[PDB]
């Protein structure tokens, strides 16, 4: 995020980090329950990647984070890689996340929910802060 | 990329209004947000775009794509969860 700010640690409990076996963060995701993570289809997640929950500072060695293995990748069959439409993939954890103060689920809306133009929302992540 | 988790508030736009920036690349399963002095960027992909609805944070978008330069004056494009939630519900039910 360019021009964002540091979050209050643990305040966005559903935020997870997708890391490859190298330990490199390549994408974010959101826990919707203890066994499923929603992420973007273009992230190209494989079962060799790891879901990291309860993390704030990727440089700290003393945070009690949960490194969860992925059992299966569910790429929306309607995802069009040429237009990046329907960019969503579900990840089923081989090991269920343990919910706590710093790890929990975000809510999903109803297909008929309305989010009006002008509404202020929040986006989170560990992406580049300057390009 | 930053070691610590970042956050930013940003407004949602309408698709008709977003097409002014991205033209026809804006499809129905997409929702635009930003162009407010902030911007999602590389490494943010897949993360959440949440809005408070009746007291709880709900998943409105998934960080998808945007300007190759993360321009804070161009809107970012997110997958619209309201158009994809029926598939999510079907997938969780079958597995």
């Amino acid at each position: 995020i360019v021009n964002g700010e540091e979050a209050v640690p643990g305040s966005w409990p559903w935020q997870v980090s997708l890391q490859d076996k190298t330990g490199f963060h390549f994408c974010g995701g959101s826990l919707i329950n203890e066994n499923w993570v929603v992420t973007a289809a273009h992230c190209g997640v494989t079962t060799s990647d790891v879901v990291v929950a309860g993390e704030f500072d990727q440089g700290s060695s003393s945070e009690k984070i949960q490194k969860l293995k992925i059992a299966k990748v569910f790429k929306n069959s309607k995802y069009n890689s040429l237009t990046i439409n329907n960019d969503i993939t579900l990840l089923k954890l081989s090991t269920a996340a343990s919910f706590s103060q710093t790890v929990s689920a975000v809510c999903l809306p109803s297909a008929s929910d309305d989010f009006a133009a002008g509404t202020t929302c929040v986006t989170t992540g560990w992406g580049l802060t300057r390009y | 990329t930053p070691d610590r988790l970042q956050q930013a508030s940003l407004p949602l736009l309408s698709n008709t209004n977003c097409k002014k920036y991205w033209g026809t690349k804006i499809k129905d399963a997409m929702i635009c947000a930003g162009a407010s002095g902030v911007s999602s960027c590389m490494g943010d992909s897949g993360g959440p775009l949440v809005c408070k609805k009746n007291g709880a944070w709900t998943l409105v978008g998934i960080v998808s794509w945007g300007s190759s330069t993360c321009s804070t004056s161009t809107p970012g494009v997110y997958a619209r969860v309201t158009a994809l939630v029926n598939w999510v519900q079907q997938t969780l039910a079958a597995n």
């Binding site: 209050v8 643990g10 305040s11 710093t102 809510c107 999903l108 | 007291g55 709880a56 944070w57």
Partner: peptide
Amino acid sequence: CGVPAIQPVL
């Protein structure tokens, strides 16, 4: 869901 134990501050 959606109600964090540690309140976010913006």
